[PDB]
Amino acid sequence: AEQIEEVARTVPGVASALAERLEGGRYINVEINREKAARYGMTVADVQLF
Amino acid sequence: MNAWLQLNTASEPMLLIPSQALIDTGSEQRVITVDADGRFVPKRVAVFQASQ
């Protein structure tokens, strides 16, 4: 879609061309550590509440 | 009684920019530099730490 979008703008009659991305999303991952949490007697569910 | 302690600590000197000025996509961090011409040119940067 990225290539097609740019060839599309080279065309004489086109004013704009934009292909929506399927994975341009941003994430903040909280990768919970079972062994680390267990130390404090916490389950994954326990941590996730925060 | 309860008491709230606020601490301020200074780090080693590092390049300082605002936080909204930094883009982080997980595998790369970048800022958008403004050129002498006004041209907007991207530049890669290495983040040390951040606060406030």
Side-chain angles (χ1 to χ4, degrees), chain B residues 1-50:
Chain B
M1 276 186 171
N2 295 316
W4 312 133
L5 179 72
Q6 178 99 29
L7 87 58
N8 279 20
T9 303
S11 74
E12 298 286 17
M14 304 262 75
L15 300 150
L16 301 177
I17 75 180
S19 282
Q20 330 85 231
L22 182 96
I23 300 157
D24 186 5
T25 67
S27 59
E28 151 182 312
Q29 12 287 352
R30 85 184 84 111
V31 305
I32 295 299
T33 269
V34 180
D35 198 351
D37 308 312
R39 169 175 284 263
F40 300 86
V41 25
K43 273 155 134 60
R44 233 100 51 90
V45 297
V47 175
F48 163 73
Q49 174 85 25

Side-chain angles (χ1 to χ4, degrees), chain A residues 7-41:
Chain A
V7 288
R9 23 179 74 117
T10 75
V11 166
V14 179
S16 61
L18 196 79
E20 57 196 3
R21 311 304 148 94
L22 213 50
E23 58 175 19
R26 264 103 101 157
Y27 288 90
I28 290 185
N29 310 289
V30 181
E31 299 173 327
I32 294 171
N33 198 134
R34 287 171 199 266
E35 275 166 292
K36 287 187 176 183
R39 208 87 144 72
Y40 312 91

